[PDB]
Design a protein around this nucleic acid. Sequence first.
RNA 1: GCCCGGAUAGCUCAGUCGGUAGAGCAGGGGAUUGAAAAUCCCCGUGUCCUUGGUUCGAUUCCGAGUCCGGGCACCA
Length: 255
Amino acid sequence: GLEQFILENSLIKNKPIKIVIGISMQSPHQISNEHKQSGDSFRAFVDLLRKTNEQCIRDENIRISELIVVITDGLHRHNLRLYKNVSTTEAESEAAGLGQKWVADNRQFLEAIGQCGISYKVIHWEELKSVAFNRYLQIVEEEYEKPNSEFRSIIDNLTQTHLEKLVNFLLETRDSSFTQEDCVSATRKYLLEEAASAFEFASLKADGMTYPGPCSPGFKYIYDTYLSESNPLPFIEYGMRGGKKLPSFWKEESP
RNA sequence: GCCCGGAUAGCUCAGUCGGUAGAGCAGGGGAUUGAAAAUCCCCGUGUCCUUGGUUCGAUUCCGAGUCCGGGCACCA
Ligand SMILES: *C(=O)[C@@H](N)Cc1ccccc1
């Protein structure tokens, strides 16, 4: 899908539109192979990008160029560390490794986006979370140091979400020996890292970042404070499905 | 993955069983001016996206393909 009704609110046209995007992954995959940024999702992002490179007499009176792609490869760490003792950094290593696994599971789409005209970047875990996280976490806690801000409401909502998720997860294996306070606090840590990912990402990348869903968790609270007056955080919503196979160039298995 | 709409003059779209599809823009020709600029008037051979059927005949009715959207399922 798209948001043509949202293109005029910013009112910056007749030029290349710097865009970004960030994918995620859950520990226990309920939909298994089906997930965000599947093959259909990447091909549909490419198609929605190419839809603005056509109709030059109807878009001048929408363009897609210079794009980037982020990955929260270092977000769901403690989510996977519950299965085995392992280590604190080993859980990171493995989760970011699966992130890079997907990054290689659809590299053809990333490279073919460059043939369609759009640039291709590849942000990762450390590539973003490697600078200015002390002041970021400090500001997150400064917003979460009072029950008046809706940051506590979003905290409780995401906490209930991750709590149901971790309850269903540990309901299969009770050998984790984790704590309810531990699950809640690790979920809140991931949530605050996602909230602090508005400051660091909005400052690291120019203009806007688009996700298929809404993704207003933490991003709204932080970006309305800082990014909305430094680098406008505009979230565009995408949405596709499966019905008729589109034309995919070099759509074959590697050999 | 499942389910629901459209494509018509060059372009926008309006056309409701199946009863020779027309309003706006554009564009050509005019009268009048010395000439243009306003105003009036004339001007559409459209397989209604191709290709198989009912009919007396199908725009929209049934079958096959091409291209634009929607509603769900999965939220994280
Ligand atoms: C899921 O765990 C999300 N918090 C991860 C995420 C999604 C989109 C953008 C940034 C982070």
